[PDB]
Amino acid sequence: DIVKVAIEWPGANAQLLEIDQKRPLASIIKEVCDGWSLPNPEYYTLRYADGPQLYITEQTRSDIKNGTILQLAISPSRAARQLMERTQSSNMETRLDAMKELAKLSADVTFATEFINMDGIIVLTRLVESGTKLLSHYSEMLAFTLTAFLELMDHGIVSWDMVSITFIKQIAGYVSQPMVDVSILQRSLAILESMVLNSQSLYQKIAEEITVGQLISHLQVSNQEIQTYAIALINALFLKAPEDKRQDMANAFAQKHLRSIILNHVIRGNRPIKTEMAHQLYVLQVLTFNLLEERMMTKMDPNDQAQRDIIFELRRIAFDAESDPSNAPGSGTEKRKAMYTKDYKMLGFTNHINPAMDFTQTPPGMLALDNMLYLAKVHQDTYIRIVLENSSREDKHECPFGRSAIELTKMLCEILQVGELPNEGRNDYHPMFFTHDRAFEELFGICIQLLNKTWKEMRATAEDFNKVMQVVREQITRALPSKPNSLDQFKSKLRSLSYSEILRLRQS
């Protein structure tokens, strides 16, 4: 086809051309240079005048729409060679302006490919590792160099394995040290993040050079952009951590108050939360919820006494206090088992005899058991009341704790999207999970109370089990878009969202 464009040249009138797409670029350029009386048309290449001003090749020339504004520019190969030479100049103002142009052009893959194939990567890292540090614009010069280096690496042409490890150690040292120039920190964080996300070997080297506290300390500053690349680097470490070692890493960051620091410095910060930051919060929240996946898909081993002891503990907390008689021995082994079995019926388990079988269902697996124990140990008052008010299965209107807690845990996993890998587009996150160290377990506690309130508000029976759960799912889902900044606020909206309320709201 034929596309009409205009091509510009500094200090001269633009040329209006009808581009024949069947015609070679070299021929077109030759004619253009003839119009402006320019020698050596082989020196030049077409380039967009506006926007990113990308170089144009024979493969990308299809995207040139009608009315596009182009510029006759120095060819990417010739420019790459000129700039690399100017970076080895005796004049330093020469090198600052050269490096500044490198920081701009390195984003263009057409230019980057040329510069990289001129041993460009090692040219830059060697400027960083042994440049002259005594001069007026050292930090400025370093910043542009790091910018150009990163943009070159982000084209997926050069493996991080080829990058000098002393260079990487130096960059990591900029992050671990008490304070560095703010722009140097940003470049360093961005580099380390990209290295982690795009390799395996180098990932192990970061945990050596930089401690958890040091990486978290970059969240305690006013600069929102710093905070953003700080969490980006943290999210990268979590994301590409081996399943083997993710839980320990989450513990290490938690024991140094990663959550509360983000809560106070970002969510409760002075300046508004920007789009880039909101995305990293989404990513972080997705990654933390994914920690539950292992336990969610972990089937209980009924033959493991250590796992059965957890259920024994649940039964013990519920039914065995000092107000109760002593099941002293003399009571047959068949008689003691009879009492245990009834307890498991009163606890609402399906398999009354061996309740461990209830947790072979994955999802929610052992995660449901962890939630029950958490409720029993942290909120005994709540656990006790729930199981005692719903003890007799003979009563048709009572709610089985076991069957409910298992289903609820499954339900909460679906709503929170546990076992999902974060995309690049989402910015949505639930703020209240940043307000407590065990937010998921607290959520279960609140929702199991909700479940019981909703159950008795519907005057439900065992036959209506699935119907109640459907209501509870809707109650929780409706309270979320209001985006509560605390678990108490979330609990408050649940109070208003009673069964009588939700029924009214689909009449609409």
Residue numbers in the entry: 6 to 513
What are the paper's exact sentences on this?
In the present study, we perform a detailed biochemical characterization of the BAI1/ELMO2 interaction, and find that an evolutionarily conserved fragment located in the intracellular region of BAI1 specifically binds to the RBD-ARR-ELMO (RAE) tandem of ELMO2. To elucidate the assembly of BAI1/ELMO2 complex, we solve the crystal structures of the RAE tandem of ELMO2 and its complex with BAI1 at 2.5-Å and 1.7-Å resolutions, respectively. The RBD, ARR and ELMO domains of ELMO2 bind tightly and form a structural and functional supramodule, creating a highly conserved elongated concave groove capable of specifically binding to the BAI1 fragment. Each member consists of the Ras-binding domain (RBD), the armadillo repeats domain (ARR), the engulfment and motility (ELMO) domain, the pleckstrin homology (PH) domain and the C-terminal proline rich region (PRR).
